[PDB]
Amino acid sequence: XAXKXX
Amino acid sequence: XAXKXX
Amino acid sequence: XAXKXX
Amino acid sequence: XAXKXX
Amino acid sequence: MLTIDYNSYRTTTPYGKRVRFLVLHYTALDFAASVKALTTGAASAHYLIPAPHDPSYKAAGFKGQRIFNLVAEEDRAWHAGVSGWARRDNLNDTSIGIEIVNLARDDDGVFTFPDYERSQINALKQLAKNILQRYPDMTPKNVVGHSDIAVGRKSDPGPKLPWKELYEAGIGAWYDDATRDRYREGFERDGLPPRADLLEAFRLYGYALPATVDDAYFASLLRAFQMHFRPENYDGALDVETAAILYALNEKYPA
Amino acid sequence: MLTIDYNSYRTTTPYGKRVRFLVLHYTALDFAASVKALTTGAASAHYLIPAPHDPSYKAAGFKGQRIFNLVAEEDRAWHAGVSGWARRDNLNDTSIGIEIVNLARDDDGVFTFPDYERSQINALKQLAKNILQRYPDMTPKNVVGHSDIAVGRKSDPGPKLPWKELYEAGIGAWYDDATRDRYREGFERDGLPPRADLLEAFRLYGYALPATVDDAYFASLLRAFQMHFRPENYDGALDVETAAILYALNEKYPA
Amino acid sequence: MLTIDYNSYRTTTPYGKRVRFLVLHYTALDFAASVKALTTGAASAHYLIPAPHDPSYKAAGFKGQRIFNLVAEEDRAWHAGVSGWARRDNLNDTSIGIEIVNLARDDDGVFTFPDYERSQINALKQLAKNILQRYPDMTPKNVVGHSDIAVGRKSDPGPKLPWKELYEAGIGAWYDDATRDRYREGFERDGLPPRADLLEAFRLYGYALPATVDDAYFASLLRAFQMHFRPENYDGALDVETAAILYALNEKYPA
Amino acid sequence: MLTIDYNSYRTTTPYGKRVRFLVLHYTALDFAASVKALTTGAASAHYLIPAPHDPSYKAAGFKGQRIFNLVAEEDRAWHAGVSGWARRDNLNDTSIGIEIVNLARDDDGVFTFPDYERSQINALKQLAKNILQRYPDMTPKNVVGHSDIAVGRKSDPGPKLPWKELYEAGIGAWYDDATRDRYREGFERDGLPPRADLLEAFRLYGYALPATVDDAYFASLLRAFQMHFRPENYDGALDVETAAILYALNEKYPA
């Protein structure tokens, strides 16, 4: 697991 | 296109 | 300029 | 060791 | 023209590498499902360590133990999501993630963690040495689990991960048994430290904490911590065994 | 011992480049001092852009414009410092840093900002253009000044940095003139937002802000924002055009 | 331990990059067929420039002009096969290859080369500037075609490639019209140089020749050369126009 | 202006790593001289392995073993020179080069070969092991001495290089003892091959040979081959064990 960001 | 080598 | 480590 | 350019 | 001069001066002292963390995961899915995911889905990982006995791995054509690079290390995988550790906060930017195939169960409310294969571990061992030798700011506290960086939100790599075994192979942080013992005894004798004193001590190790920690959180904290450093019991309750280790750790590996 | 399989599976969709920012700085030091510091001192940048009319540059064996690469792009240069933008906060991790020699005289207590040489600005253009082409998540608002990420702390690259020209060559964000004029008259008629709403608008643009904003700080914010986007007056005084530009910017780049 | 010191010393003067050549190809296949090939087949390329009007490109979901990176530049694509140029001999090791989608016909004995799109060229132009600025030993004679490096074995990128146009954008080698003219006139007046004198002169430009050149080879040589530097007629026969250019080239770009 | 699409298509099967060789060298210079030369002189290597008992090493601020990285692995170090192996011939393009400080005294006209420090050999092991894991086409015969690629010209890393030990740690090629003994007795009974067949066998192993082989040259070949694989006698004299080892090697690594 998993899980992008920001 | 083409054409690896060596 | 400037200015962080390691 | 030694020894080519650029 | 104009072309870049790569030769007249190079920085020596004041620079580093971008990557300073290694993160471990379990796939929770068989080979087929996991590869299909991490190559094309909504998450990825730099490295994938298959289980050689998972039938879909055999049925793909592979026989022995492999290590797959999916994303090169110069690039950024989506392996860690919203996270935090040692004062940084979005760990895809600054880490390499490793994923191992392993069928944990999660969505019952009740967790089950199957053991890893021996071949999976030797791979994981030599792969992690290889990386650590190439990233100088990947200090031992920086080999971490997804559980440690996304506390209360994730459970991998799980309590079946042989952390101390890796430590003996020069991978990650672990206590001296003597230093833990000194804390153990002292804690029984004089009692445990204040709550605020312990949260602070978790911070120092690297745990990313809010300003205020409810008791729900504290549990998740203690639990995710115990999956790593006190696997034998991760009920998530305050303990002497527990505290003695947290202190032994951040005595050995302080600022 | 194993070797890595780089050929069986490659992640396509769910990955990224680590770098998503581009920070611009000035040196405040002539070439010789400049080069020595970013090479052995306590800071570095990826790229160095010299002023050709600099006796220390000529003394080095140079004459025409150059672009120096000091630190690889994959590596981490120590340029940004303690910083913030988008929703990130150690921008060194996650940016390329460009440094241009410029003799910006110090704050005791007033600032002097020399023009840039025409040759330098051209270099910058082609260099930034090259970088922007290879880092997809590096979008118009993500090209920033040091003054933009370290608000209060830094004043580089200064108001002689031709931001608008750069934009016209495809580098960085800029507002449409018509949109600015709309926000200009809307505030001229309806009055400016209160400081609170303004801040949100600043944070919305990209500014890493505190919770508590001081009068002094708000002033530095205004000042930093001004140097980049309304260089003809960087008082730190809140006026209609400055807000209008901000709001015009938010409208154009909804991100 | 033991971990690698990346900081105590860096080489400055005596090093380079591995890549020093850029090679151009035509796909000869529509989008679908070409991508399916170069990603999974028996050859690859670092970069792929699609034709925006090829129906299988539309039917894949793309609208505008793109540039696809298939293999990162640090890696080695199989784009050039058995080749040779400027005394090196296996150009995958030392080059970046660019492939453009374009339906040439080859297996009739008789060749047909359709023209490229304008959007394809602007991409090709800016992509090649970008690369040249980052590889210092990619001198102008080092932007070459597959025809030039595998003479008599390949025909791409073909005579529809706007070589001089790129030259005007600072991409690749091309003659001064005045210097060609001086050779043109001198060759008419005094006759052409000996065969051995001309083969030597082709070598100097970069052409990889056997010890002995039959007349079959010579043709392929002259022809593949003319597809690049004298597109208007590539019958492959010795000519004055031809020689005058070969000499103008390797006068302008000598050792 | 465009940007590159790194997410739509990735080449899987038909690509490679540029590097496929690993050259081993000695310095012939103490640490200080050694480091200065490979940093500013006319040669470089990727990696530098120092001798800890070297007054210039201690004088530098060092004591324990280190591994220095001077030139990035993606970049091209000037170590190999004019060289040949497999079917390649500018091995600088296509290898990583490791350099170890060793005080090998010069040919006026006799060679002196000091032992390596035990610490150095361990470094080498872990370093080579790390490299070999990340470059798949770098196979046992592709780990070579400078003496192996520049036959006649170079004598490094010398016969004190523990090749067999390295092999046992998974580095480089070595023969099975039983196989050597078979070729030993087969030649003891049937006689050695003529020089012509021998050469083919040498070229088959990896040696870049001429067309015309001099007595002097054949001797240098034998000598170079000996230093790597039968260090206990590097006469350059053709004897049964030396051929046997070669032929035993070809049998083991049919490539």
Side-chain angles (χ1 to χ4, degrees), chain A residues 1-3 5-6, chain B residues 1-3 5-6, chain C residues 1-3 5-6, chain D residues 1-3 5-6, chain E, chain F, chain G, chain H:
Chain E
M1 289 172 96
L2 205 41
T3 189
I4 300 171
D5 184 1
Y6 282 97
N7 284 272
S8 290
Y9 314 82
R10 308 297 298 162
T11 304
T12 54
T13 316
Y15 93 99
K17 313 248 160 183
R18 306 194 179 269
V19 181
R20 45 169 74 237
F21 304 119
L22 186 53
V23 186
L24 299 184
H25 324 259
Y26 63 46
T27 187
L29 255 67
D30 72 283
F31 191 66
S34 51
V35 181
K36 186 179 175 185
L38 304 168
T39 52
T40 72
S44 61
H46 295 101
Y47 292 107
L48 184 61
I49 312 202
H53 287 151
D54 153 40
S56 70
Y57 176 73
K58 294 199 195 99
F62 307 110
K63 312 182 177 171
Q65 176 72 73
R66 277 170 182 254
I67 301 183
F68 296 112
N69 175 253
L70 304 183
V71 174
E73 310 179 0
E74 49 270 49
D75 297 322
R76 184 196 170 226
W78 304 343
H79 72 96
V82 14
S83 39
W85 186 253
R87 291 188 246 291
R88 312 241 165 186
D89 64 50
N90 194 331
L91 272 70
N92 313 258
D93 308 327
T94 37
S95 68
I96 290 171
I98 307 186
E99 195 121 23
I100 309 112
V101 336
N102 198 76
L103 304 159
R105 309 287 300 223
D106 55 333
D107 44 347
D108 312 311
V110 290
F111 286 82
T112 70
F113 303 92
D115 289 40
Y116 293 93
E117 306 195 42
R118 182 44 49 182
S119 67
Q120 288 195 303
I121 298 304
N122 301 120
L124 176 55
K125 282 213 268 176
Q126 75 158 209
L127 172 61
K129 290 170 201 183
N130 192 294
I131 305 169
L132 281 158
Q133 295 172 13
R134 287 167 19 232
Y135 296 91
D137 296 316
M138 220 186 245
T139 67
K141 321 201 313 181
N142 283 10
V143 198
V144 300
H146 206 169
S147 62
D148 304 341
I149 68 178
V151 27
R153 213 189 87 250
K154 297 253 149 211
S155 279
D156 40 313
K160 256 51 207 160
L161 204 301
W163 283 108
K164 180 174 173 173
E165 174 179 347
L166 305 188
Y167 161 87
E168 293 169 7
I171 305 157
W174 197 266
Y175 54 90
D176 304 316
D177 283 29
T179 297
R180 164 203 56 202
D181 286 351
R182 198 204 321 128
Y183 285 105
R184 195 145 77 141
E185 288 146 14
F187 282 125
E188 323 194 74
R189 213 132 184 274
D190 291 38
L192 294 183
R195 213 169 108 131
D197 216 324
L198 285 180
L199 291 150
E200 176 54 26
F202 270 109
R203 279 162 183 145
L204 299 184
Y205 189 76
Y207 287 95
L209 298 177
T212 57
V213 168
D214 66 43
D215 300 5
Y217 200 84
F218 214 98
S220 271
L221 177 59
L222 297 173
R223 170 176 140 162
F225 175 67
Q226 280 156 351
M227 296 207 265
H228 194 146
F229 300 93
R230 215 280 301 265
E232 309 93 37
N233 183 27
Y234 56 97
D235 40 348
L238 189 51
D239 190 23
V240 156
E241 179 55 15
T242 288
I245 296 183
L246 171 61
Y247 278 64
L249 280 176
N250 65 24
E251 196 228 82
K252 181 177 199 190
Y253 301 111
Chain F
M1 52 147 288
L2 301 193
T3 72
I4 305 178
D5 182 348
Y6 295 107
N7 291 111
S8 284
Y9 304 93
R10 305 304 308 178
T11 286
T12 54
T13 296
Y15 90 106
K17 295 320 199 75
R18 293 190 195 267
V19 178
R20 63 180 59 224
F21 301 120
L22 182 49
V23 190
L24 301 193
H25 312 265
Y26 64 46
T27 64
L29 265 41
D30 75 329
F31 177 78
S34 178
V35 60
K36 194 183 162 187
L38 301 167
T39 254
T40 322
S44 60
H46 296 86
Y47 292 108
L48 178 56
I49 299 183
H53 295 163
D54 179 344
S56 69
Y57 183 66
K58 286 183 248 151
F62 298 105
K63 198 208 189 296
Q65 192 67 71
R66 296 271 275 214
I67 306 167
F68 293 107
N69 183 245
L70 303 180
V71 178
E73 258 189 11
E74 72 227 52
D75 284 340
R76 180 200 182 241
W78 300 350
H79 64 105
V82 175
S83 42
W85 197 256
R87 249 114 67 119
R88 314 226 168 202
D89 75 317
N90 213 285
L91 268 61
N92 241 325
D93 291 352
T94 211
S95 61
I96 283 150
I98 306 177
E99 186 115 327
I100 311 155
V101 343
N102 198 76
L103 265 292
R105 204 67 179 151
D106 301 315
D107 43 336
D108 263 14
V110 289
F111 290 88
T112 317
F113 297 109
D115 280 54
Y116 288 90
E117 295 192 53
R118 173 42 51 187
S119 63
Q120 280 176 318
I121 302 308
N122 264 56
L124 187 53
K125 279 171 149 197
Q126 197 58 239
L127 175 61
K129 226 175 182 271
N130 194 304
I131 298 163
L132 285 160
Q133 285 172 359
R134 297 178 281 107
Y135 296 93
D137 300 286
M138 193 184 303
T139 61
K141 285 196 297 187
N142 285 353
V143 193
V144 287
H146 205 180
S147 76
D148 290 324
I149 64 182
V151 36
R153 251 222 298 146
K154 308 322 247 151
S155 291
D156 40 335
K160 292 278 194 296
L161 208 283
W163 280 110
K164 192 176 175 177
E165 180 178 335
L166 262 49
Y167 161 77
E168 282 160 353
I171 311 150
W174 199 265
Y175 58 86
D176 301 324
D177 281 335
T179 308
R180 188 236 310 139
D181 299 349
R182 282 192 264 113
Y183 286 101
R184 212 177 176 159
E185 56 180 285
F187 291 151
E188 272 164 15
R189 280 161 198 158
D190 261 90
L192 281 177
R195 185 181 291 178
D197 285 315
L198 236 45
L199 290 178
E200 184 58 18
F202 268 127
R203 263 192 304 263
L204 177 56
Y205 187 79
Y207 290 97
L209 289 180
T212 316
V213 178
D214 196 7
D215 254 9
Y217 183 76
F218 190 63
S220 315
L221 174 59
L222 288 176
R223 192 179 112 113
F225 176 67
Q226 271 152 5
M227 289 177 172
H228 182 161
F229 292 111
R230 195 203 65 192
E232 55 274 12
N233 183 14
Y234 51 97
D235 276 15
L238 166 72
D239 60 26
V240 178
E241 201 210 347
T242 308
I245 291 165
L246 169 68
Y247 268 77
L249 267 168
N250 281 336
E251 193 186 281
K252 175 156 174 187
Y253 296 91
Chain G
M1 289 172 96
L2 205 41
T3 189
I4 300 171
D5 184 1
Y6 282 97
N7 284 272
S8 290
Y9 314 82
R10 308 297 298 162
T11 304
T12 54
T13 316
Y15 93 99
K17 313 248 160 183
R18 306 194 179 269
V19 181
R20 45 169 74 237
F21 304 119
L22 186 53
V23 186
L24 299 184
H25 324 259
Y26 63 46
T27 187
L29 255 67
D30 72 283
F31 191 66
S34 51
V35 181
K36 186 179 175 185
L38 304 168
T39 52
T40 72
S44 61
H46 295 101
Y47 292 107
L48 184 61
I49 312 202
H53 287 151
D54 153 40
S56 70
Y57 176 73
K58 294 199 195 99
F62 307 110
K63 312 182 177 171
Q65 176 72 73
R66 277 170 182 254
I67 301 183
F68 296 112
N69 175 253
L70 304 183
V71 174
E73 310 179 0
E74 49 270 49
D75 297 322
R76 184 196 170 226
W78 304 343
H79 72 96
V82 14
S83 39
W85 186 253
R87 291 188 246 291
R88 312 241 165 186
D89 64 50
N90 194 331
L91 272 70
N92 313 258
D93 308 327
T94 37
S95 68
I96 290 171
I98 307 186
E99 195 121 23
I100 309 112
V101 336
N102 198 76
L103 304 159
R105 309 287 300 223
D106 55 333
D107 44 347
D108 312 311
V110 290
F111 286 82
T112 70
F113 303 92
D115 289 40
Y116 293 93
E117 306 195 42
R118 182 44 49 182
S119 67
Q120 288 195 303
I121 298 304
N122 301 120
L124 176 55
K125 282 213 268 176
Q126 75 158 209
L127 172 61
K129 290 170 201 183
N130 192 294
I131 305 169
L132 281 158
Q133 295 172 13
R134 287 167 19 232
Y135 296 91
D137 296 316
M138 220 186 245
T139 67
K141 321 201 313 181
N142 283 10
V143 198
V144 300
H146 206 169
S147 62
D148 304 341
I149 68 178
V151 27
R153 213 189 87 250
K154 297 253 149 211
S155 279
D156 40 313
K160 256 51 207 160
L161 204 301
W163 283 108
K164 180 174 173 173
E165 174 179 347
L166 305 188
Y167 161 87
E168 293 169 7
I171 305 157
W174 197 266
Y175 54 90
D176 304 316
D177 283 29
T179 297
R180 164 203 56 202
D181 286 351
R182 198 204 321 128
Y183 285 105
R184 195 145 77 141
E185 288 146 14
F187 282 125
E188 323 194 74
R189 213 132 184 274
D190 291 38
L192 294 183
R195 213 169 108 131
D197 216 324
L198 285 180
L199 291 150
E200 176 54 26
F202 270 109
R203 279 162 183 145
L204 299 184
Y205 189 76
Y207 287 95
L209 298 177
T212 57
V213 168
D214 66 43
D215 300 5
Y217 200 84
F218 214 98
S220 271
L221 177 59
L222 297 173
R223 170 176 140 162
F225 175 67
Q226 280 156 351
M227 296 207 265
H228 194 146
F229 300 93
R230 215 280 301 265
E232 309 93 37
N233 183 27
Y234 56 97
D235 40 348
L238 189 51
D239 190 23
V240 156
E241 179 55 15
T242 288
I245 296 183
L246 171 61
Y247 278 64
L249 280 176
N250 65 24
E251 196 228 82
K252 181 177 199 190
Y253 301 111
Chain H
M1 52 147 288
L2 301 193
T3 72
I4 305 178
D5 182 348
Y6 295 107
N7 291 111
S8 284
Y9 304 93
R10 305 304 308 178
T11 286
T12 54
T13 296
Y15 90 106
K17 295 320 199 75
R18 293 190 195 267
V19 178
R20 63 180 59 224
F21 301 120
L22 182 49
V23 190
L24 301 193
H25 312 265
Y26 64 46
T27 64
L29 265 41
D30 75 329
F31 177 78
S34 178
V35 60
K36 194 183 162 187
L38 301 167
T39 254
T40 322
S44 60
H46 296 86
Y47 292 108
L48 178 56
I49 299 183
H53 295 163
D54 179 344
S56 69
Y57 183 66
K58 286 183 248 151
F62 298 105
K63 198 208 189 296
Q65 192 67 71
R66 296 271 275 214
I67 306 167
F68 293 107
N69 183 245
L70 303 180
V71 178
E73 258 189 11
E74 72 227 52
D75 284 340
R76 180 200 182 241
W78 300 350
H79 64 105
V82 175
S83 42
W85 197 256
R87 249 114 67 119
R88 314 226 168 202
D89 75 317
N90 213 285
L91 268 61
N92 241 325
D93 291 352
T94 211
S95 61
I96 283 150
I98 306 177
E99 186 115 327
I100 311 155
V101 343
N102 198 76
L103 265 292
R105 204 67 179 151
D106 301 315
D107 43 336
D108 263 14
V110 289
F111 290 88
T112 317
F113 297 109
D115 280 54
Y116 288 90
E117 295 192 53
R118 173 42 51 187
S119 63
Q120 280 176 318
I121 302 308
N122 264 56
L124 187 53
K125 279 171 149 197
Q126 197 58 239
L127 175 61
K129 226 175 182 271
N130 194 304
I131 298 163
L132 285 160
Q133 285 172 359
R134 297 178 281 107
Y135 296 93
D137 300 286
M138 193 184 303
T139 61
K141 285 196 297 187
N142 285 353
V143 193
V144 287
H146 205 180
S147 76
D148 290 324
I149 64 182
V151 36
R153 251 222 298 146
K154 308 322 247 151
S155 291
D156 40 335
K160 292 278 194 296
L161 208 283
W163 280 110
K164 192 176 175 177
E165 180 178 335
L166 262 49
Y167 161 77
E168 282 160 353
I171 311 150
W174 199 265
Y175 58 86
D176 301 324
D177 281 335
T179 308
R180 188 236 310 139
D181 299 349
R182 282 192 264 113
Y183 286 101
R184 212 177 176 159
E185 56 180 285
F187 291 151
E188 272 164 15
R189 280 161 198 158
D190 261 90
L192 281 177
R195 185 181 291 178
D197 285 315
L198 236 45
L199 290 178
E200 184 58 18
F202 268 127
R203 263 192 304 263
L204 177 56
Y205 187 79
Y207 290 97
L209 289 180
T212 316
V213 178
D214 196 7
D215 254 9
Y217 183 76
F218 190 63
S220 315
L221 174 59
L222 288 176
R223 192 179 112 113
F225 176 67
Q226 271 152 5
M227 289 177 172
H228 182 161
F229 292 111
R230 195 203 65 192
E232 55 274 12
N233 183 14
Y234 51 97
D235 276 15
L238 166 72
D239 60 26
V240 178
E241 201 210 347
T242 308
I245 291 165
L246 169 68
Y247 268 77
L249 267 168
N250 281 336
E251 193 186 281
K252 175 156 174 187
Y253 296 91

